[PDB]
Amino acid sequence: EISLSAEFIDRVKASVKPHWGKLGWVTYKRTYARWLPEKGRSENWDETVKRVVEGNINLDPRLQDSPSLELKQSLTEEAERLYKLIYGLGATPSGRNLWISGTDYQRRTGDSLNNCWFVAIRPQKYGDSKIVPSYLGKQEKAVSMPFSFLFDELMKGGGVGFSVARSNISQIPRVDFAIDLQLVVDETSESYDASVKVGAVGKNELVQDADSIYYRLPDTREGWVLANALLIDLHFAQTNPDRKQKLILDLSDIRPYGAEIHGFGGTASGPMPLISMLLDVNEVLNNKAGGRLTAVDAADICNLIGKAVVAGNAELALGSNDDQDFISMKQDQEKLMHHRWASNNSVAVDSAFSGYQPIAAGIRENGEPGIVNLDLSKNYGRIVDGYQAGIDGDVEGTNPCGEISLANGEPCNLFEVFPLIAEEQGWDLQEVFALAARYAKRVTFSPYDWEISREIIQKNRRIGISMSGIQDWLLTRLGNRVVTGFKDDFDPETHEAIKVPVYDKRAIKMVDQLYKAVVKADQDYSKTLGCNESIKHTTVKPSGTVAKLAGASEGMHFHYGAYLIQRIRFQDSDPLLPALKACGYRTEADIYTENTTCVEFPIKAVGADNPNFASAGTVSIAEQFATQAFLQTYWSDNAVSCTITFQDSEGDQVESLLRQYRFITKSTSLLPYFGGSLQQAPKEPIDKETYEKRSQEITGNVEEVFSQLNSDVKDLE
């Protein structure tokens, strides 16, 4: 087993200073630092990175076949470089990886290293997977399969994109039987009352007869999935020969709310959310008994499921562009508040499509729907590499953030690099992206629970090396924004006069070399391992949380402002508050949430004093489209995630721009530049003078003060 020595760590810590953003360390402490029962304290940065790096390196498949002494030392040195890179924050894996990589939970939980997936909502076989209904054969198709997949990955903390295109919904058979459902929660359970409140009946009130179908739920994630799978499959004759229409699900064993759970810092929700979900999911199905399920019904069930996972504390529905019922489903206020908020909805289009008029109207109202061009996604890598028939022919959708082109049951597999920071930390970018590629490649050899995922991954070995802090990197290195201006031109088909962007040709070369570096890295590593080369390699994700660790601009997004006071909200009991107060940070009771404290962090954006500096509120919608297009053309062979924000005075341009880029954009997400005016803004803009004054008030090092207090005060955490 490859590992890093204490001697090496201390050396890195001695020469490498983590490039924390003004909110970085704090964000790390309350987000990725796991609790150490042995030591009675949460992890320190160096420790987290150690287990993350070790957890990834030990995935290399060669280490499974009597690894040679040379092999193990080479991997050890690669791990040491990896540790130095991540520790310095010049690059990092996904937030999920930072939280679970190298942990006991990870090693005992399949799919634990991937945070997003895609699945088509059409009857499918469960195949030889960890979860398989008892009443189902392996190769036997079931209506519940896609829902079970989504339910499972969602409970494992991931996000799931799914397709309810008309083509899939039509594959779902007529709802043959309206099922009578009773949810039992024994009077003895510590969740009895609470459950009765949501519709469950005591063991006494239970009305049973010999013909009823009965299932005792094991107090496990699988128990939850199988119970919803049973409920669904009983509505269809194909998976219910006995025509039994009496189901009794017993959730007396489900652990109560607050109960300790494996794989999360949080606790259990109790069976209550599961009860409601099963009851509501049954209604949607019963309400169509003898009829047919629509995309709205299919999406509602997925939404109800997502809602049950969120519980009392992550989806993307992709449908047909002509399905008006689906497109309008989230506008129903009552149902939006009850569960349709669970997913963000988009429609599938192709380059031939031009019906953007109604789509634009929707977008100008609520920012929905989003768009996914399956045509371009299946026939293109980077747009510059031109049309390539079926290069990604198995693509059927994308993940919730929409940066990865995905096939049915396929997961996202990301790694984020911050070009500006890596360079400032003395790294050669070409080498950074190569380490990135290999990290991702290894994740593809981790344990996966679903057969369909194993197969597709074996064939694709897809990786998604993301580039973040893009605006900081370009403004600094170029002195201006990738889009230097616009020149006149005409639409390639309609000859319509339009404004095309002029890109800084310097940017093309720098991103192109990095792309080729990831491809070379993947080609060589694929040879060494003897597996398939990654079908795709790059993308852009606006990973907010991780970008905060390093204080980098998120994905390709622009900064909210040059100089700002950023407010971070903490529970009044949070261990970090005394340390922050001791360091000079200004605090105030939060007016939007009870028992919460706001802490003010003065922040200066890179290039704040550059006349080419652009704040998100001032960047034209036309320029945002051009910027996304640039990255999709010369960098990402997957997609480009970014929220294009516009002022109402720009709404007249939404339909026009969507049409203009119909031959380049794989997916689009627009949102009316809201804001209005918040009395206690999470991001308040200030002038340079105010920023300097405020930052001078902070003369204490929170990381050091926290450790000191933690030491002098017992049970601070």
Side-chain angles (χ1 to χ4, degrees), residues 2-203 205-259 261-312 314-673 675-713 715-717:
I2 305 300
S3 55
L4 298 168
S5 66
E7 186 176 301
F8 171 68
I9 301 165
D10 292 315
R11 227 140 63 227
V12 172
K13 297 171 61 182
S15 56
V16 178
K17 173 188 181 182
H19 189 287
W20 294 119
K22 288 296 175 65
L23 321 177
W25 186 80
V26 176
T27 295
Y28 155 65
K29 291 298 289 186
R30 63 186 308 203
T31 317
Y32 308 117
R34 298 182 68 72
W35 177 259
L36 304 172
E38 317 282 278
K39 303 193 172 186
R41 70 170 171 70
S42 64
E43 292 176 339
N44 294 309
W45 183 221
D46 73 82
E47 301 175 297
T48 296
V49 176
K50 170 169 159 58
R51 66 162 168 72
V52 174
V53 172
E54 270 171 41
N56 181 266
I57 195 69
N58 288 311
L59 282 179
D60 189 303
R62 287 174 296 178
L63 293 171
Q64 304 303 304
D65 309 294
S66 297
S68 63
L69 188 64
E70 183 182 0
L71 173 62
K72 306 181 66 181
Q73 179 53 37
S74 188
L75 283 182
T76 294
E77 274 170 49
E78 192 187 325
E80 301 187 330
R81 279 180 283 165
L82 204 50
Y83 183 106
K84 180 175 175 180
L85 175 62
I86 300 170
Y87 182 75
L89 289 174
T92 183
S94 69
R96 162 56 67 79
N97 280 256
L98 294 179
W99 176 254
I100 216 73
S101 188
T103 62
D104 294 295
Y105 171 81
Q106 181 258 294
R107 295 193 254 70
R108 77 155 181 289
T109 302
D111 306 335
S112 62
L113 297 170
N114 306 87
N115 224 190
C116 10
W117 312 73
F118 171 77
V119 63
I121 306 305
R122 59 167 167 270
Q124 295 177 54
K125 64 179 183 181
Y126 278 72
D128 186 46
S129 307
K130 271 47 185 54
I131 298 176
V132 176
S134 64
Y135 53 67
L136 283 176
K138 223 101 72 174
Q139 318 315 298
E140 178 175 357
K141 297 191 177 188
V143 174
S144 68
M145 190 289 187
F147 300 100
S148 291
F149 180 83
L150 175 133
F151 196 4
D152 187 42
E153 298 310 327
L154 282 171
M155 278 191 292
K156 290 170 177 176
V160 180
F162 61 86
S163 177
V164 288
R166 284 182 183 287
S167 64
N168 293 314
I169 299 306
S170 75
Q171 294 189 57
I172 300 181
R174 45 170 170 173
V175 182
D176 285 344
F177 319 117
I179 303 301
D180 181 50
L181 178 66
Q182 303 184 73
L183 303 182
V184 189
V185 167
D186 179 34
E187 293 66 22
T188 217
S189 180
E190 304 180 7
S191 305
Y192 171 68
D193 288 311
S195 299
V196 169
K197 288 185 296 68
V198 295
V201 294
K203 211 149 289 179
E205 329 302 299
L206 182 61
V207 179
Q208 169 180 50
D209 59 65
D211 178 55
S212 293
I213 302 173
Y214 170 98
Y215 180 39
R216 158 69 84 179
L217 275 67
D219 173 26
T220 66
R221 155 172 53 73
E222 305 64 55
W224 281 42
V225 175
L226 296 178
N228 178 62
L230 174 58
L231 173 61
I232 292 171
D233 291 324
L234 286 183
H235 283 74
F236 309 77
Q238 67 184 69
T239 49
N240 186 4
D242 280 44
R243 323 182 106 273
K244 297 170 179 299
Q245 309 178 211
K246 295 184 177 182
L247 178 54
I248 306 171
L249 295 178
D250 196 319
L251 327 191
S252 298
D253 290 324
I254 306 307
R255 74 192 58 168
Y257 167 99
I261 57 174
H262 16 297
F264 294 114
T267 51
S269 60
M272 294 74 75
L274 177 61
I275 291 163
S276 308
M277 185 205 98
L278 291 165
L279 294 177
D280 292 336
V281 163
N282 195 44
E283 290 187 295
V284 173
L285 290 168
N286 285 347
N287 288 40
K288 290 305 187 71
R292 298 282 279 179
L293 295 173
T294 63
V296 173
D297 297 317
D300 272 332
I301 287 173
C302 289
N303 292 182
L304 288 171
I305 294 177
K307 176 193 186 186
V309 173
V310 169
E315 310 179 339
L316 179 147
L318 178 61
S320 299
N321 67 66
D322 61 34
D323 186 335
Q324 293 315 305
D325 291 318
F326 170 70
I327 300 175
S328 300
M329 77 180 277
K330 288 184 60 172
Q331 279 165 308
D332 172 339
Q333 297 301 293
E334 181 207 288
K335 288 197 172 185
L336 169 72
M337 283 186 251
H338 186 268
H339 65 278
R340 294 183 180 168
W341 54 268
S343 73
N344 285 312
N345 313 329
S346 294
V347 296
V349 302
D350 56 42
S351 299
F353 182 71
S354 61
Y356 290 106
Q357 185 168 281
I359 289 174
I363 292 171
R364 302 178 64 170
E365 177 187 304
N366 53 57
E368 301 300 313
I371 299 174
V372 176
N373 190 317
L374 294 172
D375 184 12
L376 291 177
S377 294
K378 291 186 287 187
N379 305 308
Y380 281 81
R382 295 187 303 157
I383 307 314
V384 73
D385 290 345
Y387 183 97
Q388 300 196 188
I391 190 176
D392 219 332
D394 287 343
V395 172
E396 292 192 56
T398 191
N399 58 303
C401 291
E403 78 263 33
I404 309 299
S405 306
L406 295 174
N408 188 46
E410 193 175 9
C412 55
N413 179 29
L414 322 166
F415 194 87
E416 198 144 56
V417 177
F418 305 120
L420 188 54
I421 300 175
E423 291 182 334
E424 299 173 308
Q425 286 287 49
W427 286 87
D428 151 52
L429 293 189
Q430 179 297 302
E431 162 172 37
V432 171
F433 284 93
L435 287 165
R438 297 172 65 92
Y439 180 104
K441 198 77 186 194
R442 278 194 292 286
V443 171
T444 73
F445 288 84
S446 53
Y448 289 95
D449 300 326
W450 298 81
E451 184 185 69
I452 188 174
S453 300
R454 291 196 293 264
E455 320 217 321
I456 188 61
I457 293 172
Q458 169 64 60
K459 176 181 169 187
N460 291 348
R461 296 293 178 183
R462 197 193 299 277
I463 60 179
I465 305 312
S466 182
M467 180 165 89
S468 192
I470 297 172
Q471 293 312 314
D472 297 332
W473 183 53
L474 300 179
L475 181 59
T476 301
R477 211 162 177 189
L478 298 176
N480 55 288
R481 302 190 300 286
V482 71
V483 181
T484 60
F486 294 75
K487 71 175 181 184
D488 282 353
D489 203 353
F490 311 78
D491 186 82
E493 301 191 319
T494 63
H495 305 118
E496 167 179 48
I498 56 176
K499 291 291 190 166
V500 173
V502 183
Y503 298 123
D504 195 300
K505 302 184 288 71
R506 289 174 292 170
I508 296 174
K509 190 56 189 177
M510 37 208 286
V511 302
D512 181 63
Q513 301 188 308
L514 299 172
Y515 173 58
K516 298 186 179 303
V518 175
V519 172
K520 175 170 185 174
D522 168 66
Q523 297 179 314
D524 305 343
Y525 200 25
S526 297
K527 171 54 182 176
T528 295
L529 296 183
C531 70
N532 293 298
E533 309 192 321
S534 298
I535 187 174
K536 295 302 187 62
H537 321 69
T538 55
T539 183
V540 175
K541 186 184 188 69
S543 297
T545 305
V546 152
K548 293 174 195 170
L549 291 188
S553 48
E554 325 200 309
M556 61 159 262
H557 292 0
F558 289 92
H559 287 287
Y560 179 87
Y563 295 103
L564 304 160
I565 287 301
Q566 288 211 53
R567 294 185 169 76
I568 307 307
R569 311 205 306 189
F570 296 82
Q571 252 164 164
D572 286 1
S573 293
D574 195 310
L576 297 177
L577 287 182
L580 287 163
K581 293 194 172 182
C583 294
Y585 290 99
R586 288 198 181 174
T587 69
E588 70 193 304
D590 167 37
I591 63 188
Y592 305 117
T593 314
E594 188 164 39
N595 306 302
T596 293
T597 299
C598 278
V599 179
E600 315 189 356
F601 296 75
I603 297 182
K604 178 175 183 177
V606 176
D609 297 310
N610 183 314
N612 284 311
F613 178 82
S615 57
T618 71
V619 181
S620 77
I621 183 177
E623 191 181 333
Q624 292 183 62
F625 265 92
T627 303
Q628 165 182 43
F630 179 82
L631 299 169
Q632 181 65 78
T633 300
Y634 309 97
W635 166 250
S636 173
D637 55 353
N638 274 292
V640 180
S641 181
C642 77
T643 299
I644 296 175
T645 55
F646 57 96
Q647 313 296 312
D648 28 51
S649 64
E650 292 180 300
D652 301 287
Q653 297 176 55
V654 179
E655 200 213 305
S656 311
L657 288 161
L658 286 166
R659 296 203 312 287
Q660 193 182 327
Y661 292 88
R662 65 188 187 289
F663 302 110
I664 295 178
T665 307
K666 289 180 186 187
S667 70
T668 64
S669 186
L670 279 65
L671 192 64
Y673 185 90
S677 182
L678 283 176
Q679 181 152 39
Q680 194 179 69
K683 291 187 191 178
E684 186 185 328
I686 56 178
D687 59 56
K688 185 178 184 178
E689 266 255 35
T690 302
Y691 164 79
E692 313 193 309
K693 292 189 176 191
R694 293 297 297 285
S695 50
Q696 292 173 179
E697 283 171 42
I698 306 164
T699 49
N701 180 299
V702 66
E703 180 175 1
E704 289 172 42
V705 174
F706 182 73
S707 178
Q708 163 270 308
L709 276 167
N710 216 189
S711 311
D712 305 330
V713 181
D715 292 1
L716 180 61
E717 293 184 292

